[PDB]
Amino acid sequence: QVNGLSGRIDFHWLMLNPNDTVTFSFNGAFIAPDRASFLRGKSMGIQSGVQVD
Amino acid sequence: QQFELIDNEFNEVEKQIGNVINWTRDSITEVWSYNAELLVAMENQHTIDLADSEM
C-alpha cells in the first residue's frame, strides 16, 4: 500500500518514426495520451544538488 | 570527448548491471591513466632530446 492506494499505473513508451502509424486496440484499463512529444534540439543532462550560477 | 550518463545516482540501476558498469568504468579509467602518464612521459623525453639538439 503506497501512500494508501494499492493500485498502480505503469507507463510504456515508443518512438514512432515519421510517416508511421501506431494502433491502440484496447478494452479498458487504458491511460490514453492526449499529446505526443517531439524532441526540439540537443541538450545536456546532469544530476546534482548544488546551487545554480 | 563529450559523454552523457548511463547510470544515475538517484534511482540506482539494478545491482548486478550497475556493478558491471562500475567495473568497466574503472578498467577504462586505468587504461586512460596509463595513456596519460605515457603520453606526458614521451612528450617530455621528446622535449628534452629536442632542446639539446637545437643546441
Automatic annotation (TrEMBL), chain A:
It is found in: Host apical cell membrane; Virion membrane. It comes from the Viruses. Glycans are attached at residue 19. In natural infection, inactive HA is matured into HA1 and HA2 outside the cell by one or more trypsin-like, arginine-specific endoprotease secreted by the bronchial epithelial cells. One identified protease that may be involved in this process is secreted in lungs by club cells. Palmitoylated. Binds to sialic acid-containing receptors on the cell surface, bringing about the attachment of the virus particle to the cell. This attachment induces virion internalization either through clathrin-dependent endocytosis or through clathrin- and caveolin-independent pathway. Plays a major role in the determination of host range restriction and virulence. Class I viral fusion protein. Responsible for penetration of the virus into the cell cytoplasm by mediating the fusion of the membrane of the endocytosed virus particle with the endosomal membrane. Homotrimer of disulfide-linked HA1-HA2. Belongs to the influenza viruses hemagglutinin family. This is Hemagglutinin. It comes from Influenza A virus (A/Anhui/DEWH72-02/2013(H7N9)). The chain holds residues 231 to 283 of 560 of the full protein.
Automatic annotation (TrEMBL), chain B:
Belongs to the influenza viruses hemagglutinin family. The lineage of its organism: Viruses, Riboviria, Orthornavirae, Negarnaviricota, Polyploviricotina. This is Hemagglutinin. Palmitoylated. Glycans are attached at residue 22. Homotrimer of disulfide-linked HA1-HA2. It is found in: Host apical cell membrane; Virion membrane. Binds to sialic acid-containing receptors on the cell surface, bringing about the attachment of the virus particle to the cell. This attachment induces virion internalization either through clathrin-dependent endocytosis or through clathrin- and caveolin-independent pathway. Plays a major role in the determination of host range restriction and virulence. Class I viral fusion protein. Responsible for penetration of the virus into the cell cytoplasm by mediating the fusion of the membrane of the endocytosed virus particle with the endosomal membrane. Binds to sialic acid-containing receptors on the cell surface, bringing about the attachment of the virus particle to the cell. This attachment induces virion internalization of about two third of the virus particles through clathrin-dependent endocytosis and about one third through a clathrin- and caveolin-independent pathway. Plays a major role in the determination of host range restriction and virulence. Class I viral fusion protein. The chain holds residues 400 to 454 of 560 of the full protein. It comes from Influenza A virus (A/Anhui/1-YK_RG123/2013(H7N9)).
